[PDB]
Design a protein around this ligand. Structure first.
Ligand SMILES: [Ca+2]
Ligand SMILES: [Ca+2]
Lengths: 87, 138
């Protein structure tokens, strides 16, 4: 599979969006090699200024992952916002 | 290899008079586990009113939903932190109405999920101890 739809915020691909996802993205953002993040995970993690906010299939090699993605995920976890976000 | 030990996270039991603003420091006891992140509700029993939440320095900065009294933290680079004993996870202020009847008003944890540095659930290793505001007289 060369592209995939995001389940927004589910970095670790376990079906839940929670602080495990935040922690693992923060770990990966800090150093890509510390977490074997999947192509699906990458697509899932890119929830701030994503490639396609209507939720169609996207390319994992064209994600833009930053700490702001993590900030959006943790905000979504406590229901302050819904994913995806922009700015 | 999920982080092995334990901690206890304690909402305190405090005395208060009707009309009083109450600051509750929620603290770590017997800290013996590295925690990377957590999410939880803490809710007070009526008619005690909710003021606000403030971050503690036990683990990581609190991201609060004040409407839902739903809170979360995640260490900025995904490291586990073994908090200092007695350190504040979160600080919650409440206000006791002047017409509050004498009694025990629980302040309780719920909907907790706690994670280690590798994304493993460690909620079971953390004892979540409810507290209370015990209202007396005026
Ligand atoms: Ca997840
Ligand atoms: Ca992004």
């Amino acid at each position: 599979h060369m592209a995939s739809k995001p389940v927004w915020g589910d970095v670790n691909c376990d079906g839940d969006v929670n602080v495990a996802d935040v922690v693992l993205l923060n770990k990966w953002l800090n150093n890509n090699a510390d977490y074997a993040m999947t192509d699906q995970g990458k697509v899932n993690a890119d929830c701030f200024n994503p490639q396609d906010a209507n939720g169609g299939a996207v390319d994992a090699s064209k994600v833009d992952l930053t700490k702001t993605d993590s900030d959006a995920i943790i905000k979504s976890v406590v229901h302050l916002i819904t994913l995806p976000a922009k700015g | 290899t999920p982080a092995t030990g334990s901690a206890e996270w304690v909402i305190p039991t405090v005395n208060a008079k009707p009309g009083e603003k109450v600051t509750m420091d929620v603290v770590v006891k017997n800290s013996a586990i590295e925690v990377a992140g957590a999410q939880f509700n803490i809710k007070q029993t009526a008619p005690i009113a909710y003021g606000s939440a403030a971050s503690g320095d036990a683990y990581a900065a609190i991201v609060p939903n004040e409407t839902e009294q739903y809170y979360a933290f995640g260490e900025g680079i995904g490291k586990g932190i073994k908090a200092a004993d007695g350190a504040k996870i979160i600080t919650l202020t409440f206000n006791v109405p002047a017409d509050c009847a004498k009694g025990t008003y629980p302040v309780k944890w719920s909907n907790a999920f706690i994670t280690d540095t590798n994304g493993n659930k460690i909620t079971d290793k953390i004892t979540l101890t409810d507290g209370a505001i015990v209202v007396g007289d005026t």
